[PDB]
Amino acid sequence: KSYYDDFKDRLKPGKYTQGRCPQSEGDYRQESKTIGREHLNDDGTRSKRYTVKEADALGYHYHPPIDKKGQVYVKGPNTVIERGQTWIKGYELPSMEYTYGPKQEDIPFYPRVKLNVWGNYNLVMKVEFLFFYLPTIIVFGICIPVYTINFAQEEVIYTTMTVKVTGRQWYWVYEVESPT
Amino acid sequence: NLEDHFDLAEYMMKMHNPMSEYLYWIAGFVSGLHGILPLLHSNYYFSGMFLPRDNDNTQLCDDSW
Amino acid sequence: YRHWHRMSEDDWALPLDSMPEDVKTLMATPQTERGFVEDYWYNRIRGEATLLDPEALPSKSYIALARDMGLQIVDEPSSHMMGLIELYEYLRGASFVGPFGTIENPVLVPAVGQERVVACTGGVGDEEHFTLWFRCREGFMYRCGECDQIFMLVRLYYEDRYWTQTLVRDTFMSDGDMFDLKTLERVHKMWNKDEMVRWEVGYWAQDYVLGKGVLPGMVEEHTRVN
Amino acid sequence: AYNGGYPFHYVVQYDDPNYDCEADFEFEEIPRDEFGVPAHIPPELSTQIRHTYYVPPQYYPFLKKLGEDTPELKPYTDKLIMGDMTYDDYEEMFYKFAKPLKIYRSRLPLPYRTDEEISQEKYVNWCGRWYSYRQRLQGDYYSRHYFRDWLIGVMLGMYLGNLCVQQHRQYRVDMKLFYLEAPEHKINWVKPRGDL
Amino acid sequence: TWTEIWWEHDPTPKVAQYRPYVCTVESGKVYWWCACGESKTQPWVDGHCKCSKREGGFRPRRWEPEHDGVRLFCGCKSCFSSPTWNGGCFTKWMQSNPAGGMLYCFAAAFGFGTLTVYRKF
Amino acid sequence: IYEGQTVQESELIPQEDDWVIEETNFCLGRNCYVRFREEDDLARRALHQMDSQLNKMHTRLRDGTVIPYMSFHPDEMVDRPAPIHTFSEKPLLKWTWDETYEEAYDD
Amino acid sequence: FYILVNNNKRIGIYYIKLSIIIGILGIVLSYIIRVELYNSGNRIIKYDNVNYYNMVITLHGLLMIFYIIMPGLYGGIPLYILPILSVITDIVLPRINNISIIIVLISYIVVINSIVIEYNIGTGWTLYPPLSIIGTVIVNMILYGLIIIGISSIISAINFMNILIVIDGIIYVYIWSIIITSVLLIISLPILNGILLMILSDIYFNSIYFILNGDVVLYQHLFWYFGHPEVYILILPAFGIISIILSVLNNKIIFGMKSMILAIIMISILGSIVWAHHIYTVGLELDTKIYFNNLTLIISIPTGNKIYNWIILYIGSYNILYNGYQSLIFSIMFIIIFIIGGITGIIISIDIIDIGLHDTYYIVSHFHYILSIGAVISLLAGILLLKDIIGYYNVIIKINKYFGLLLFININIIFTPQFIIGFNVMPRRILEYSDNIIVWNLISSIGSISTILILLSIF
Numbered sequence A: 001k002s003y004y005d006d007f008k009d010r011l012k013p014g015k016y017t018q019g020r021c022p023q024s025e026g027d028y029r030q031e032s033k034t035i036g037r038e039h040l041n042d043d044g045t046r047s048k049r050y051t052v053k054e055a056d057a058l059g060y061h062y063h064p065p066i067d068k069k070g071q072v073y074v075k076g077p078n079t080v081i082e083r084g085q086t087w088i089k090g091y092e093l094p095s096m097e098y099t100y101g102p103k104q105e106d107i108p109f110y111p112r113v114k115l116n117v118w119g120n121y122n123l124v125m126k127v128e129f130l131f132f133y134l135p136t137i138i139v140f141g142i143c144i145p146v147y148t149i150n151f152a153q154e155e156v157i158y159t160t161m162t163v164k165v166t167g168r169q170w171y172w173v174y175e176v177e178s179p180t
Numbered sequence B: 001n002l003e004d005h006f007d008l009a010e011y012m013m014k015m016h017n018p019m020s021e022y023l024y025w026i027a028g029f030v031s032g033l034h035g036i037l038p039l040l041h042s043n044y045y046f047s048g049m050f051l052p053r054d055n056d057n058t059q060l061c062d063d064s065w
Numbered sequence C: 001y002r003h004w005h006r007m008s009e010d011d012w013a014l015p016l017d018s019m020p021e022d023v024k025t026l027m028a029t030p031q032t033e034r035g036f037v038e039d040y041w042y043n044r045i046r047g048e049a050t051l052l053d054p055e056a057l058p059s060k061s062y063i064a065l066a067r068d069m070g071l072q073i074v075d076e077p078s079s080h081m082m083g084l085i086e087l088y089e090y091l092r093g094a095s096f097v098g099p100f101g102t103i104e105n106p107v108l109v110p111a112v113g114q115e116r117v118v119a120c121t122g123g124v125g126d127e128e129h130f131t132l133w134f135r136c137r138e139g140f141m142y143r144c145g146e147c148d149q150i151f152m153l154v155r156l157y158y159e160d161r162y163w164t165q166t167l168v169r170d171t172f173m174s175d176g177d178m179f180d181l182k183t184l185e186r187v188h189k190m191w192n193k194d195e196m197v198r199w200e201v202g203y204w205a206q207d208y209v210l211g212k213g214v215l216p217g218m219v220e221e222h223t224r225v226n
Numbered sequence D: 001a002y003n004g005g006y007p008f009h010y011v012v013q014y015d016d017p018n019y020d021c022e023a024d025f026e027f028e029e030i031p032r033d034e035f036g037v038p039a040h041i042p043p044e045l046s047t048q049i050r051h052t053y054y055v056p057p058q059y060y061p062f063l064k065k066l067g068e069d070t071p072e073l074k075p076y077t078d079k080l081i082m083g084d085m086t087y088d089d090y091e092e093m094f095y096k097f098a099k100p101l102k103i104y105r106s107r108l109p110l111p112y113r114t115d116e117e118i119s120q121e122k123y124v125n126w127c128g129r130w131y132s133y134r135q136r137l138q139g140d141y142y143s144r145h146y147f148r149d150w151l152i153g154v155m156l157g158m159y160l161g162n163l164c165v166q167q168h169r170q171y172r173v174d175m176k177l178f179y180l181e182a183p184e185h186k187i188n189w190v191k192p193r194g195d196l
Numbered sequence E: 001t002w003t004e005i006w007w008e009h010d011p012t013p014k015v016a017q018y019r020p021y022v023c024t025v026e027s028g029k030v031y032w033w034c035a036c037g038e039s040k041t042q043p044w045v046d047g048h049c050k051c052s053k054r055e056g057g058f059r060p061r062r063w064e065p066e067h068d069g070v071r072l073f074c075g076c077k078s079c080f081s082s083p084t085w086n087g088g089c090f091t092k093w094m095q096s097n098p099a100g101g102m103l104y105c106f107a108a109a110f111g112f113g114t115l116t117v118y119r120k121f
Numbered sequence F: 001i002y003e004g005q006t007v008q009e010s011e012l013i014p015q016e017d018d019w020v021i022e023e024t025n026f027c028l029g030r031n032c033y034v035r036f037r038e039e040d041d042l043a044r045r046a047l048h049q050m051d052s053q054l055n056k057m058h059t060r061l062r063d064g065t066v067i068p069y070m071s072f073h074p075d076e077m078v079d080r081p082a083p084i085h086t087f088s089e090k091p092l093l094k095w096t097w098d099e100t101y102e103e104a105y106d107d
Numbered sequence G: 001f002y003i004l005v006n007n008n009k010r011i012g013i014y015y016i017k018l019s020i021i022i023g024i025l026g027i028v029l030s031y032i033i034r035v036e037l038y039n040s041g042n043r044i045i046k047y048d049n050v051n052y053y054n055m056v057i058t059l060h061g062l063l064m065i066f067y068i069i070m071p072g073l074y075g076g077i078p079l080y081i082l083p084i085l086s087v088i089t090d091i092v093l094p095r096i097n098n099i100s101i102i103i104v105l106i107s108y109i110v111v112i113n114s115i116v117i118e119y120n121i122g123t124g125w126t127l128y129p130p131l132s133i134i135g136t137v138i139v140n141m142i143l144y145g146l147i148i149i150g151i152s153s154i155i156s157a158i159n160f161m162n163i164l165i166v167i168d169g170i171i172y173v174y175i176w177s178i179i180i181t182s183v184l185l186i187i188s189l190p191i192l193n194g195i196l197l198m199i200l201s202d203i204y205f206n207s208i209y210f211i212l213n214g215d216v217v218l219y220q221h222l223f224w225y226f227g228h229p230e231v232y233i234l235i236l237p238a239f240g241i242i243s244i245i246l247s248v249l250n251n252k253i254i255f256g257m258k259s260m261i262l263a264i265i266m267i268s269i270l271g272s273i274v275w276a277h278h279i280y281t282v283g284l285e286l287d288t289k290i291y292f293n294n295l296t297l298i299i300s301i302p303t304g305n306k307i308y309n310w311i312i313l314y315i316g317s318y319n320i321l322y323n324g325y326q327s328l329i330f331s332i333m334f335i336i337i338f339i340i341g342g343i344t345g346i347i348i349s350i351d352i353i354d355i356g357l358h359d360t361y362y363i364v365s366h367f368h369y370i371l372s373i374g375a376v377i378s379l380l381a382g383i384l385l386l387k388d389i390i391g392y393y394n395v396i397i398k399i400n401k402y403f404g405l406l407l408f409i410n411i412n413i414i415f416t417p418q419f420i421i422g423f424n425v426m427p428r429r430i431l432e433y434s435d436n437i438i439v440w441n442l443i444s445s446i447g448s449i450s451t452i453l454i455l456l457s458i459f
Ligand SMILES: CCCCCCCCCCCCCCCCCC(=O)OC[C@H](COP(=O)([O-])OCC(O)COP(=O)([O-])OC[C@@H](COC(=O)CCCCCCCCCCCCCCCCC)OC(=O)CCCCCCCCCCCCCCCCC)OC(=O)CCCCCCCCCCCCCCCCC
Pocket: B008, B009, B010, B011, B016, B017, B019, B020, B021, B022, B023, B024, B025, B026, B027, B028, B029, B030, G002, G013, G016, G017, G020, G021, G023, G024, G383, G390, G392, G393, G394, G395, G397, G455, G458, G459
């Protein structure tokens, strides 16, 4: 089945590009005049006065929430006494169809399974040893070659001729002994 | 307040003004121009052309164009 | 607690200049209607009035003596609440370690709201697993998917309010016989005479009942320069 | 044993009733401590002197009543009556009778579960144990399979590497024959170009 | 060999075929794959096998393609990527006929060796 | 290394011969982009987002206990998208030990 | 407000946003380079304006390293999740966090303004003297940017170190990754500042450290004493991300957590003592060369342990879970790509091999495979994992197999040929080249234009 067709009705195609009319047709920049919406603009976004110009963190509209007894309003649990016991019924979230749209049917089955752990401690320890010491062996296999080739570059040789090379911007000067 | 629960609530709730996105893209576009415009200006300053013609610093055949 | 900073001077006692000037109404206000400062000075005035009357102490019951000093007689309801309050406060800056949770005795997760983030580390030794974080919402008996450790959320909620020492004292303590100002005057004359004040709080308190400035030296005590 | 022995908060007394340590700038008044010791007597000496609390005798009958109702408290009250209670004795009395707050699990409301659900607790525990048994066994099984497979990669990487060893081997043979037999090697051939 | 020698509490399928089944599938359609190897409408559940009757721990395996096309499906009923095929049918066959497995593996390795050596050399 | 909880054979013995492993689906459901209603304002769209949190979901077992959405790290425990103030009540990492004290018990 | 916000999560978003913006300038410069190198001749830069190319390569390197990848992997993802991973309400130093991002932006504006106003010349991103000290004022401006950037980096490092004092949970591997990078910054930055001040002294205060009887090789020691720790300050946060993604997406607990942590610590100590592998061709003493070559090869050991521990994380994971998510693909691609970059690093580590391959495009391809491919993909993978938490939308990335495939193929078309021309050999930091190197240069150029086109499809 096509699950999109189930909630097609909720999705009415839009009319305005970016979901707003031209400011001339309706001024969404102004604060809403509706009672209880003085902190919102006409289009529903928070007004600059509420968030910037008169932000409460800056000392505007000072109103301490806590009361004299050091208390704030707290909503209680859904308590249901039964069978000589006081129970609390937890709040279950609404069906995912309401929030997301797809109808919650024909859900694929993913069973409960405890974590996929590697076992056999002895075997695992040996692998971890190899994870460290196999590279170490390779490095040791390169070490001797590295020493030899370094020694080879820095070998005192019986050179019989010298060519002096100076690098300047932007050319190479060469000084060579002239035949006598 | 419920409106203040989420950081950048208007954007996260998909109500933000599109101009914010346009400015971000424009800012990136201007940043890119800082590599192209001085290239053209410097080329003209030292040569008299905004951009070279491929291989115009080398010998070209008579019919090359 | 280790997370608290150093005791203030106020943590021990309050300055007598914070005593309410309308003592007559202060001693008649119900406990539920007294603020923090008013409640401090109600208890101190009444408590010290009984303690500074030695001849009456031996004949006074512990129930009456505790009431005069403002101490709450403990009971299982109030003990439960106070204990869970102090456990919440301790967990603010302390680790959360205890016995493995089962259906009979779930791990108790105190919270003020309807949810608190909790992590299960499994059992002890080899039964310990990597931290598995979950959101513990009220009204559900949670079971770890790995070790089957049972968790439960305990809410410090009472009648549209959370649990505080002030709330516990207001809900369970009952105001006794109204404080008699004659006792204040009688004890005042006992320890304060001929320019000697051995009950400073009762000299200030009696002055306010008299109207402020009546007793010797009190006008000079109340005259400040800044 | 904290802050070098200096109490964070302590009482100071002044003989002159109108003395103010902030307004006055005189140089004759000597402050006293909580017990009344003048400041010019050092702490090392004053702390050795024994100070005891003296309550008015009208309190003795009350302190006696406390001891009788709580016999464990009697020795401390007797010291106070006899003027033998120091500050340390008072502290011992104070902390001896402090008790911890008690929490009762029977008063906690429980998450709602039907009687049908409560009768299935053993079954769910049984499922959990079998899940842990199957998990633990699979760990051994998988560890053996995949770590053994990694050997196939070693062997595949040893075969592919050996291909380049053979190419390198043939390369060195060829190089040894260049200067010896290869007609590509030419001598007395390149002549200097000269400056342009 | 998990069901054979390690664990005796999981259902053990019967091999319908040691070769994958080739089938054309359509996006947006749900298919049900036989996990017991006794269905007569392979690779799908026929409504009469163990999977259809929910017998002995056998249940149909739900599957849905992302795009239309021809997909290989497991006949051995043990492939790691079941219902889809990934080569486990050949692996399970080698367990059952180890002598045959060696012959194929030698032949495959022989060809791979010749080609890689011929090109690089 | 961790290899699961240890099991004693006595704990693997059923109380009935028909007991099998419970077949409860741990797929939470079908989801997509959270879909806001046009009619809802900023405040009511915030409520909608708070009601679509996967980390507030769970699976209820046959005995009434629920296995919650769990994660290795606490990054998956805050509301999505992350609110300005997340962990007001300090998240509690529960450690287990065998130590006990007498005050906790009653005879 | 926007600029005044101290929220650590908002600031994390700012770091990613600014990295993308500045990144546009970085990519544009890269396109200029590859276009020029398409054939031999002059293509988009005149022969009289060759100084611009030198400036393009210099700014490309500096911006991508200090203004894009570092602000993205050490400033962006860290500032958003670290306080959450530490189960703490917010970052320890709120006001310092705000100024750090502002500082980065201000130093960026200085750099780009210097392009527009100053004469355009270049001396490499390594600012070797005496060339750096005989240049024009644009070099002075770049120095100011680096010093200003250094201030932001150090204060941010101080901020992360303070989490140890407040962390209320367990220090996860990722937290360990950031802490060690912070330590590497605290120890390396002060040395960089000193040598940069000496560059300024010679540029602006008539100092003589980099003229005869003063050793120019001195700069290279102090610079690279910060240089190489920098490359691990840029990669270690990426490693931390890879660990989280693999464990979360595969639903598998990290294997060898303590070895992962101790591998990160080891890489840092070793990375603080191997800097002179960048100075092999200067003419250092035989024993020095052997020491540095030996210790450089040791870094592979701890780095190798981490790679294999990642592999076993992906092995054995459930087949039912869909594996085509972009974050998972990028995390896996990182292992495949990082091994290529690291192995080539070991090749260049041998000094005798390095004589042939120093200042050639083989070095380019080496550090591109790690940074331009590995680090970028790691940052993308990390952001992608946190898409729900961050909450961004209006892009098609989360499930886009075309983008991953095209990116992987084309990025390799750019830099794989650069390994070949390293044995051709084509020097680095050049624009003109011999006609017999066009084929490979052309192939890489075709790869660059293609990658840019794929960046447009995400929107
Ligand atoms: C690498 C690239 C590819 C990457 C691919 C991969 C990406 C993976 C995903 C990554 C996701 C990262 C995390 C994202 C988190 C997002 C969170 C978020 O949205 O936060 C909310 C945040 C703000 O939302 P809000 O909360 O509603 O904010 C309300 C405002 O605070 C208040 O509202 P207001 O309206 O009151 O606002 C005030 C407004 C008021 O604005 C106005 O009034 C505007 C009026 C119109 C002006 C328009 C521009 C005009 C330009 C004219 C130019 C003329 C040139 C002429 C040339 C002539 C030549 C001859 O602005 C101002 O006053 C100041 C503006 C300053 C900023 C703009 C600067 C522009 C450039 C300037 C250059 C100057 C150079 C000078 C040089 C001088 C030299 C001497 O969003 C944004 O800011 C937009 C973000 C959009 C992108 C989000 C990411 C999407 C996913 C990625 C897409 C790909 C992007 C690629 C990069 C760009 C390419 C170009």
